Ligand binder design. Structure first.
Ligand SMILES: NC(=O)c1ccc[n+]([C@@H]2O[C@H](COP(=O)([O-])OP(=O)(O)OC[C@H]3O[C@@H](n4cnc5c(N)ncnc54)[C@H](O)[C@@H]3O)[C@@H](O)[C@H]2O)c1
Ligand SMILES: NC(=O)c1ccc[n+]([C@@H]2O[C@H](COP(=O)([O-])OP(=O)(O)OC[C@H]3O[C@@H](n4cnc5c(N)ncnc54)[C@H](O)[C@@H]3O)[C@@H](O)[C@H]2O)c1
Lengths: 487, 487
């Protein structure tokens, strides 16, 4: 439905009339045309935000909170309208859009609604006679850039904290999946959000994206994307030394020890990499199995893989859908051919679906490939339904395999040994680690990377901190200075 | 005195024999020759640090704490030895090195010594049957770069937090003022700090400094310097997306209202800009006086300015010394000539004093210049004993003046009106604001900039947070999720 820029509370076309095609991943069909934002457009969106900020941040915190709260209830009223718009644009089964994407986007906004007035300053114990209080205040206009894997969920992950804190926002979704988030802004002002407090500006990365990260009135830039692109954001920020949050990606590891609950681990590991058609940043795209249970696991796992109802996203009975862009699909498939050239033994799937109906879309089937570590495809992020299997025999060997990546966003492990579980989670260099479960998120629990998967967290009290400055104020009440320059 | 690199617990020469002259700002005399660190040298210092990290962070926190605590006591034992070494190298009057520089360096280390085992993780309220605890862990190798205005104090400001947190350090002081901090590392290992846990690598900005910010094993780079140089640090960090802390400087404002206590304000304002020969970032290099008290203030202020015992840093009766480098002296003086070309009326000092002994050192005398805002010298940081005076008539005009800068790091204001004091401190865009006092710091009270004076704080619980990652661990104890892919 909606498809234009949203600047200062009005849906407007791109200043230079720019346009971008938004396609359905299921049949290649055109869904609609997006107003394509360019430098001149963001200049406006940011100016709109800059203008709206003083009044917005001047609102009592409780008020910003109440609006977020209503937005959350409102998103649930339009539960189906949204789940449908999203799954259509991204290829997410409605199985997911209805039960995950939407409720978790609302739950997140609700969290931060209840958060806005619980952000407290502090009073520092200090020299006698002085009073040092430190206020925690909004940074200013905040620029946010997201990818296209959870377009809907990201709106809550990203704007949720920034808004509660009192910041004013300019957000550029994925030229590939803007539709979802455009409806959200409408829902915002429907619920009472002042004009200009939020501004959506879909557009190419090197136009909208770059113009945004470079902008001189933008006080912080919050980016979720690839390591490659993260560097172009860092470069951009040097213009006015704006703060940065980097949510780059990772090759999440998924270890299964000898004493694991094979059934639960197969189901977890399958949900881990295959849910959301493998386009999860936290996706366990590296399996790591103990020798003694490796065979027994793959028997049950591969079976499960081949029996996955893959098809039309709009089918309530569809378990897995297509990749969200034609490009990627391509990419992935080349990553598969590559894994074979290095001696990979493809154990399930491996190419596009046989079906005539299926090949109108960017589909690829559940792929599992046996390999060695230090292989090219066990290092670089294959952003698809693609799992590599390796085997280990000692705890220490498993840790070594899990840490031999330049990526450390997420990882998990399956055991029933008290010591082993905690020892491992402590040793693995990763921003988060799941035991006997996987891909569990929750607003309030810090979500972010470590090292080359970036800095800054989303979700928690941590998230709020990232969107807030510290004004320190000293008041001399009862302490009398003795002149430094003694008369 | 002590003059070589310090890498892996040994004083060593630069790998390529490089050398740098360290001069006394009082007479131009040579003090000694510093081993000049270059790329190859930091490669070692960082490797030493990377190696020492595992063991160091593995120590119980309380242990790291105890060492910091002893280092603080030890620094006070060598109180004079250091105050003397510092004031000699920097031109800081001893009266200042003895009573300020040294005790505040110890105090800060002592703070963070008591802090190391009070850094707590958190346990998140989460879905029933799960247990989500979030540990707060060290980053790894931390690189720190400092300027030359408080060489001694910075060692505590910077390494204090980083070490307590469990990080391992590689620090590049100011080629111009390395001596002070070299002694400190010796003191560290004297007190029991493992070899490699701290590494000092004095050297040129574009050799040591650049190689350090670019290094791929460095997990965070903490920089204190100029806005100009800050951008080169941001560029460098794109190599491995290392975290950044920036403390670029600022043109601190110092407002005096009609109802001020004008004696106390003259003494504060004088201490503000002239203490430490004006080479304070937080230095009030912009006076702002109400019409009704402007004249009366300057009468008392200018008198005080001209009556400032300016001379030999080693004289216990010296009130103000030289600038720490010949290049600054020269820049500065040019900034003075500039203020005149724009119609500035120099009210006190204005050129190099013309004394005998002082004709050899990089001296400049207390300068006060009447001007208008928007003038070139009221915008750019004159890093010297240099105050510009402007006048205002309404509160609102004063705020406008104080905010018309790119910089936002130091502000102060003098009033006795409850409302005015708080309203103002809340409106001024600055990371910290002092009322009826100035340049008051304290470990525990966050010290940092806002906007183009950078991000990140030193000195507080905040400071600890900037030197620490968040590992989130999920444990499934009583969870029986339906398999996502329903059989
Ligand atoms: N850390 C997390 O929580 C998290 C969550 C979801 C996805 N991801 C990561 O997202 C990635 C997928 O997205 P991608 O393949 O399109 O990478 P990408 O960096 O090219 O695209 C991401 C977004 O940034 C914008 N962009 C592209 N180039 C830009 C530029 N030069 N300047 C400014 N902005 C620009 C795009 O328009 C887009 O919407 C993965 O590698 C994955 O791991 C991370
Ligand atoms: N915000 C604060 O807490 C704070 C505290 C003290 C000083 N300051 C600011 O610091 C300034 C003084 O420093 P400056 O005039 O010598 O400029 P500067 O930034 O060049 O010098 C400071 C340090 O930066 C390092 N450095 C320089 N060039 C580098 C490069 N190309 N790559 C990596 N590292 C490099 C140097 O080797 C040096 O020791 C002031 O303007 C002042 O207000 C800010």
């Amino acid at each position: 439905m909606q498809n234009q820029l949203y600047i200062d509370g009005r849906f407007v076309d791109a200043v230079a009339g720019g346009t971008i095609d938004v396609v359905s991943p299921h049949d290649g069909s055109l869904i609609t045309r997006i107003a394509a934002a360019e430098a001149a457009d963001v200049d406006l969106a940011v100016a709109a935000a800059k203008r709206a900020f003083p009044a917005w941040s001047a609102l009592g915190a409780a008020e910003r909170g109440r609006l977020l709260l209503k937005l959350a209830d409102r998103i649930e009223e339009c539960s189906e309208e949204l789940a449908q718009l999203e799954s259509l644009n991204t290829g997410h089964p409605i199985r997911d859009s209805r039960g995950l994407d939407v409720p978790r986007t609302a739950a997140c906004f609700r969290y931060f609604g209840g958060m806005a007035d619980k952000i407290e300053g502090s009073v520092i114990p200090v020299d006698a006679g002085f009073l040092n209080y430190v206020q925690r205040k909004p940074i200013g206009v905040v620029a946010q850039i997201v990818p296209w894997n959870f377009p809907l969920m990201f709106t809550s992950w990203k704007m949720g904290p920034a808004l509660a804190a009192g910041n004013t926002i300019v957000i550029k979704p994925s030229e590939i999946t803007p539709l979802s988030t455009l409806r959200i802004v409408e829902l915002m002002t429907e619920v009472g959000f002042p004009k200009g407090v939020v501004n959506v500006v879909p557009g190419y990365g090197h136009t909208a994206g770059q113009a945004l990260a470079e902008h001189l009135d933008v006080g912080k830039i919050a980016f979720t994307g690839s390591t490659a692109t993260g560097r172009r954001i860092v470069e951009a920020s040097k213009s006015n030394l704006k703060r940065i949050q980097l949510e780059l990606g990772g090759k999440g590891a998924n270890i299964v020890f000898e004493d694991a609950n094979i059934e639960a681990a197969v189901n977890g590991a399958a949900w881990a990499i295959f849910h959301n058609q493998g386009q999860a940043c936290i996706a366990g795209s590296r399996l790591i199995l103990h020798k003694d249970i490796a065979d027994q696991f793959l028997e049950r796992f591969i079976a499960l893989a081949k029996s996955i109802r893959l098809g039309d996203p709009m089918d309530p009975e569809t378990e897995m859908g297509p990749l969200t862009s034609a490009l990627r699909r391509d990419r992935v498939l080349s990553y598969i051919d590559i894994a074979i050239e290095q001696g990979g033994k493809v154990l399930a799937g491996g190419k596009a679906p046989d079906d005539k109906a299926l090949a109108n879309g960017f589909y690829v089937e559940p792929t599992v490939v046996e390999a060695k570590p230090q292989d090219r495809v066990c290092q670089e992020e294959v952003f698809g339904p693609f799992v590599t299997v390796v085997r280990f025999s000692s705890d220490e060997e498993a840790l070594a395999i899990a840490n031999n990546t330049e990526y450390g966003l997420g990882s998990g492990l399956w055991t029933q040994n008290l010591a082993r579980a905690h020892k491992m989670a402590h040793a693995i260099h990763a921003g988060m680690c799941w035991i006997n479960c996987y891909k569990r998120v929750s607003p309030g629990s810090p979500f972010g990377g470590v090292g080359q998967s970036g800095y800054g967290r989303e979700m928690g009290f941590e998230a709020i901190h990232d969107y807030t400055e510290a004004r320190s104020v000293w008041v001399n009440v009862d302490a009398k200075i003795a002149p430094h320059f003694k008369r």
